[PDB]
Structure formats: C-alpha cells, structure tokens
Design a protein around this ligand. Structure first.
Ligand SMILES: Nc1ccn([C@H]2C[C@H](O)[C@@H](COP(=O)(O)NP(=O)(O)OP(=O)(O)O)O2)c(=O)n1
Ligand SMILES: [Mg+2]
Length: 431
DNA sequence: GCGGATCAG
DNA sequence: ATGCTGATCCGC
C-alpha cells in the first residue's frame, strides 16, 4: 500500500544528495505558500467584492462563448513502450517489467505499476519496490515505427489531427461523423486478423472502430476520451484506462456533472506544486476552483486565474491548431562527475556540435544561446546570451557557450565546478 | 532579455 | 554505485 511504498522509497533514499535537494525545493514551495497566505490575510471584503464583480462579468463572457458542436477525441496508447516490449517478447507478458535503465525508467506495465513502480522513477529504486522486476532497455526506433502505423490509422478520421508525442493525439472527428452518418455498411466493415465486424455511426462507435483497427494493425491497446473540447477529452482518456473509452455528451449539464467533483490535479497544466498551493486555499476540485474565482483573481496573475476559470467552467480549445514552428532546440547530457575545466570545455564543444547538427537538420538559425549546468548536489543554473546576428554552426555556438562557461568557472574560482549534467540550448529564431 | 521554476510526456 | 526535450510562467 501507499504507506509501504513511501516507507521503502524513503528508507532507501534518505540522506542522498538528490533527497537533500528535494527537501530544499519542498522548503521553497512551502515558502511560496506562506507568502501567498500572508497575502490572503490582507484582503478586504471590499476589494474582494469588486473582484467578484469583474471576474463574474468575464466569466459571463466565457459561458456566452461556449462551444459544444465539435467532437474532440484524445487517444493514448496503453503502457506504450512496455506494451511494445511485451508484444515482441511473450516471455514477459505475465511479469512486471519496466522500460528504461538502472538510472531512469521511461515507463512500466500495469503489472509492475501495482508495486508503485512508475515512469520518471529511477530503476534501482523500482527494483526495491519490486525485486523481481525486469528492466528492458528501450528500442526507440520501434516505438517510432509503431507510432507511424497508429498515425496512419488516425489520418483516416482527421487528416489535420494533432500528434502530441509518439503515443498521444487529438482528433477533430466532427467532419468525419458528419460524413459517416450516411455511410453504407461496407465502409464501416473491418476484418479480424470472410470474417467481419461492423461499427456504428456514433462518436463512441467511431472511437471503438479506431481502437479496434489499432489493435489489429499493431497488437497494442489504446485508451480514448470523447468530449466537446481538448481539455475535457484529455481528462476522459484516462478514466477507462487501459483499453477503454469515455464520452462526455455535448450538453452543458454533462460537462458540469463530470467537472463538479473532478480533482484539479487531473487536468493538464496543474502539477504537484499548483495542486499544493490551491490545496492551501482549500481548493481540491473544479467546483471549489469556481467558487474561489475572485480570491484567485487577487492571488494569481491574469493568465493563471483566466486559465483556472476556463478549467472551472470546462472550456478548452474546440479547434485543433496546426503544429507550429519550434521556438528552441537543445542538447543536454548527464554523466558521472566532471571536475577538470578542459574536459568541461570539451564537453561543451561536443554538445554544441550535436546542436549545430540538429539545426542543420532543420536549417534553423537563432541568436540566443543558453548553457545549462547541474552540479552534484543537483542544483541547476542556466546562463544565456543574445547576439546581434543569427548563429548556426558549431563554431559560433561554441564561441558563445565557451565564455558563458568561462564566466561560471571563474565565478567559482579557485574552486572546480563539480558537474553531473551539462546542456546547450538555442532560440530566438526569426518570424 | 534573464534566470529560476513548473509541467508534460 | 546507480536519480531528456520543449514550452511557458513569474518576477524582475
Ligand atoms: N516521465 C516520462 C513519461 C513518459 N515517457 C515516455 C514513455 C511513455 O511510454 C510515453 C509517455 O506516455 P504516457 O501515456 O504518459 N505513459 P504510458 O503510455 O506508459 O502509460 P499510460 O498512462 O498511457 O497507460 O513517453 C518518459 O520517457 N518519461
Ligand atoms: Mg500512453
């Protein structure tokens, strides 16, 4: 159980340098919360009243603009990496496995997820939650191929769909539903790998068709979420996981019912921290997020409480925007400790090289270079430089990064930098 | 623009 | 022993 999990994790992790840095970060967020409470205390019923008035005017503007006509779907491959590793090695099918290394786990099967073993967890810890664990190395190109197959299926229903990662996507199947209402039985017929099955004309049905085709073509299961906007769809896709779906019917009441007791943590954008801060105000669900809208208008910036309000009303994008041009590119690498300056400069040079190579791949030229440095106590710092003309080759990037690094090395003199990670990043591309 | 931080996958 | 990429946000 949770007690046993947190117990052995803590027992095996206590007093590490990582653990220390986590205590530091925890302390800092606690501080942020302290400040926010002290700022809550100086709020008068008056300015609060004015707040509630303005906020409600805006909210009215929102609820007026609500759109329910579109059908939005979110597909999420189940335990992806691990599912693929299981598909092609049946000697694992009934065992707890994780895709990753000893350092870090990309993911785990549900069979192992029952031991608290999860993504973003170090391997050696996961093997202490579960010593019978099989850690199988990742085969990224396979995952990309399967991804291609799945996207091929998805393009049938929404050509202009939006792929998140290798295993996630949003589809706008309004057009398809429209054209599918008057579809003969033989455009909805698929063969099991003459032996057929047929699918209906409802959204629910379109989605089980897609999931079916995916299982046939790839031998892998996916979950899906069906809702009138992206936010809602994304929350849906996780309810009936794995290999299941869920629809929110396009009526305001359904939206509100689904929302009213939805934990804020489950919406995309609200992580551990924001959850803790909102929990400090006694906000856990979206109902309470709606109630305290004015208070939030006074406590948070315009962007944050606007967002919070959208969430609390169940709004979200209903139009999938074309995957835009990128805004940054970066390479970073973790290694066992590096003290010697010349080696650090060399490392920098190499990273800059790879970066110049990637920029070359996309023909990109930018004028802001940032170096990233993570020391052995896990403290991270970045340093940037924006220059007049755009930059592209390994020589230029190294020219800048070299002197940023120089600056840090000198700044710490006569001490050596004790690095565990190093990165170089470029941005400020043209318009 | 800079630097620290949050979040997702 | 062993803890990547891109985007955005919050003050400055
Ligand atoms: N922290 C993370 C999260 C995901 N990943 C990789 C491995 C995952 O297969 C994929 C993330 O997709 P995901 O849907 O969030 N997780 P996963 O498919 O494993 O399980 P489900 O929650 O979908 O059942 O990217 C990672 O490498 N590090
Ligand atoms: Mg998945």
């Amino acid at each position: 159980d949770k007690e046993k999990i947190n117990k052995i994790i803590m027992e095996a992790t206590k007093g590490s340098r990582f653990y220390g840095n986590e205590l530091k970060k925890e302390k800092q967020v606690n501080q942020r919360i302290e400040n926010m409470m002290q700022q809550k205390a100086q709020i008068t019923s008056q300015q609060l009243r004015k707040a509630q008035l303005q906020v409600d005017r805006f909210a009215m503007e929102l609820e007026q603009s609500r759109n329910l006509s579109n059908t939005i779907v979110h597909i999420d491959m189940d335990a992806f990496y691990a599912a693929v590793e299981m598909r092609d090695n049946p000697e694992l099918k009934d065992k707890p496995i994780a895709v990753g290394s000893m350092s870090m786990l990309s993911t785990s099967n549900y069979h192992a997820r029952r031991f608290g073993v999860r993504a973003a967890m170090p391997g050696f810890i996961a093997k202490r939650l579960c010593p019978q664990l099989i850690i199988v190395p990742p085969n990224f190109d396979k995952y990309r191929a399967v991804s291609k197959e799945v996207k091929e299926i998805l393009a049938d229903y929404d050509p202009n769909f939006m792929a998140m990662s290798l295993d996630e996507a949003y589809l706008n199947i309004t057009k398809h539903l429209e054209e599918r209402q008057n579809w003969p039985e033989d455009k909805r017929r698929y063969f099991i790998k003459q032996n057929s099955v047929v699918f209906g004309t409802s959204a629910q049905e379109v989605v089980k068709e897609i999931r079916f085709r995916i299982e046939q073509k790839t031998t892998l299961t996916a979950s899906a979420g069906i809702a009138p906007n992206t936010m809602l769809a994304k929350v849906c896709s996780d309810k009936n996981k794995p290999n299941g779906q869920y629809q929110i019917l396009p009526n305001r009441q359904a939206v509100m019912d689904f929302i009213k007791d939805l934990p804020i943590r489950k919406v995309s954008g609200i992580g551990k921290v924001t959850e803790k801060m909102l929990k400090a105000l006694g906000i856990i669900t979206c109902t309470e997020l709606y109630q305290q809208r004015a208070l939030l208008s006074l406590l948070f910036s315009e962007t944050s409480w606007h967002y919070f309000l959208h969430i609390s009303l169940g709004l979200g994008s209903t139009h999938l925007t074309r995957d835009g041009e990128r805004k940054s590119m970066s390479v970073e690498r973790t290694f066992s400790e590096i003290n010697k300056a010349e080696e650090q400069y060399s490392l920098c040079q190499e990273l800059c090289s790879e970066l110049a190579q990637d920029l070359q791949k996309e023909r990109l030229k930018g004028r802001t270079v940032t170096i990233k440095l993570k020391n052995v106590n896990f403290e991270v710092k970045t340093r940037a430089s924006t220059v007049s003309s755009v930059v592209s080759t390994a020589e230029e990037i190294f020219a800048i990064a070299k002197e940023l690094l120089k600056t840090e090395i000198d700044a710490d003199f006569p001490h050596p930098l004790r690095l565990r990670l190093m990165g170089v990043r470029i941005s400020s591309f043209p318009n």
